[model samples]
Target: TVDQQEILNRADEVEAPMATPPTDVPQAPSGLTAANNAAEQLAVSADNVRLYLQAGERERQRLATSLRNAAAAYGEVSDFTDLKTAATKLESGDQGTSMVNFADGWNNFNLSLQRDIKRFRIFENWEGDAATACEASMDQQKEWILHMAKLSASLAKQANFMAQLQLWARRGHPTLADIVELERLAKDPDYQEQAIKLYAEYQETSEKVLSEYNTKADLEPVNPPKPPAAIKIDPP
Candidate 1:
């Protein structure tokens, strides 16, 4: 488990500048920088968990979508809705290898979601702290926007990972195997087409989200807090 205290400390560190509000950017919100930092971390952690959820969702969805697509590709109209429905229900329910895998994926997703929420609560408290400082309000909105961008990026990453997983599975790529087996089969020429396509899609999505976030940062101004000028020469 990621240490809660450690994560909170990191958030404070990120927002410290905002809380202190430099003289140059007197309008910047106080502790919001810390809140945004925490939120960003939560988003990243959520994405890690979401990747599995996306993969599982894709795997199940693909079982239905692909069957239809394959039929269409071969010019054969086939309605496997019943089969897909049954498979989906079974995967979500108890029993079967697919169900077992789904359960594992679901568990991972739940655990991550729990952690993300916990972190969110911590971030929420920073708003109150920001309210006490006049300067912090200016940058608070921007920090919030950055947090949202982080969340969107996280979700996008999950979506990309899911797409990649589905493509890999489509090509008979076995990902649940032991590390050695997985590595060997992953590099197979027969699986390379789907694998490559999946990776390409995942990378593309990741890049898009990252670029958007970067642009947001570029457009927005970040003001670091400044130390007070009065030197009250204290004892060393």
Candidate 2:
């Protein structure tokens, strides 16, 4: 019989050899290609543009609505009970005021109210016009963005597409430009200075009216006069 060690070695040689380890295939670079990088950057730019447009539109709406509310508030100033009372008291000779003085004060108050109302109306008109313009600008901006998106999609493979996209990105939206113009107008020295002057005058007049009310004497005395002294009676 064959030796046991020789038989074991022969059986080991006959068994299938272990499969070779999987060789790592050379792979393409794991980084983005130039075209992919450009596409990603364009997408980022588009996202940023969308974000800004949304924010700007919201702010524009808020500003426009706020100004409209202010206009409405100004228009609602009707009931002038205090002024009426003051005039009535003056006419009744209860406040001990000269007729001429009372007439002058009343006339001045009416004139001031008229002037302020006119100014408020003018300001309201200005705000309304501004709102209209802003909305128009937003519409135009939307058109521009839509047009650009379509153009970019259609011309995606063109050599100058990226350059044109960069140009569009740099140009930005019309609404932003319109907003800048609006801000400039709002803060203009002529506009703001006049507004400040008018508001200051208004505040002064309001305070004057309030002071008059505060200092107005009661229509009737709190205590009536004592009766005339009675003749002294001697004790009988």
lDDT of 2 by residue, 25-129 (tens): 111111113223443443443344334334434433443343334334333312233333333322231111122232233234334323321111112223445
For residue 59, give model 1's deviation from the true position in Å. 39
lDDT digits (tens) for residues 90-124 of candidate 1: 22311222322333343443344333322112232
Q: What residue runs in model 1 are displaced by over 4 Å at the alpha carbon?
A: 1-134, 173-236
Q: How does model 2 score by TM-score? A: 0.23
Per-model CA lDDT versus the true structure: 0.32, 0.32
Clashing pairs in 2: none
